Amino acid sequence: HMNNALHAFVRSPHYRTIPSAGPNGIVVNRDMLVHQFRDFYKTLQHCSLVDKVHLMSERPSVEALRVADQMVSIGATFLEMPLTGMEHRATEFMESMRYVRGAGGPSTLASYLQDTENCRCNSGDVVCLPNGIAVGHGPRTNAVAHTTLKQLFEVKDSFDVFTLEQEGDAPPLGDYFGFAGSNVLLTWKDEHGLLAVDQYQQKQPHTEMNVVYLEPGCHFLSFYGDHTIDVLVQKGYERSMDSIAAAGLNPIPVQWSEMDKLGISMRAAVLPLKF
């Protein structure tokens, strides 16, 4: 066991402003929610995924829990997202950057995507792979972003940038499509994961991939980068947990019902910074 130098920033929920119901109308239990987040923070603390967990101060909007939206880390680059859809979150991202700097992190973030005209990109649509990234193309991440990410990182000699075309109702790619261990592909069993898997296996047909089919809705957390086998799995998805352990991985159950109902994946609630 060795320390991966990965730092995870999260923001605790503001109890007073937790909505009573999620975007679809299902009931949300704020007492359960703050319970689950404290347990989630403690789970991140003792596992192989991250090294150090940093808690950030409360803000009066449940959107501020989506700390992953601010940036994505590709290699040693901390790539800022364009603010075209989230101008109202500038002051939040700001405050988050003070926590990053205070922990010994970067002084600034790379502004390539912010300096590129008409570039739309969502951090969840970028998924880190063995020697490259898979980027979803669809309702959040447009083709300029794919063009820009390729010139930023693609190396044909190798670092691949796979474009995976998404349907209009696809969630961010990383919510249902991920990597674990050395060569394990994690994907949801719905139209979105199955399409992404069909596309990715054609673009990379040379290294055979162990595809693990999770149940649709099974929130999971695993970022490739030591090939640790720890994968956070939403508590309640029994068969998914079986599928993950059937592939030599370590499924770690996390109670996530209330953040699930809020529309916030575990991935969205953790800002992982590859120091």
Author numbering: 6 to 162, 166 to 233, 235 to 284
What does the article say, verbatim?
Kinetoplastid protists such as Trypanosoma brucei undergo an unusual process of mitochondrial uridine (U) insertion and deletion editing termed kinetoplastid RNA editing (kRNA editing). However, gRNA directed, processive editing requires the RNA editing substrate binding complex (RESC), which is comprised of 6 core proteins, RESC1-RESC6. RESC5 is a key core component in forming the foundation of the RESC complex. Similar knockdown studies revealed essential roles for RESC5 (formerly called MRB11870) in kRNA editing; cells depleted of RESC5 exhibited 80–90% decrease in edited mRNAs and 2–4 fold increases in pre-edited mRNAs.
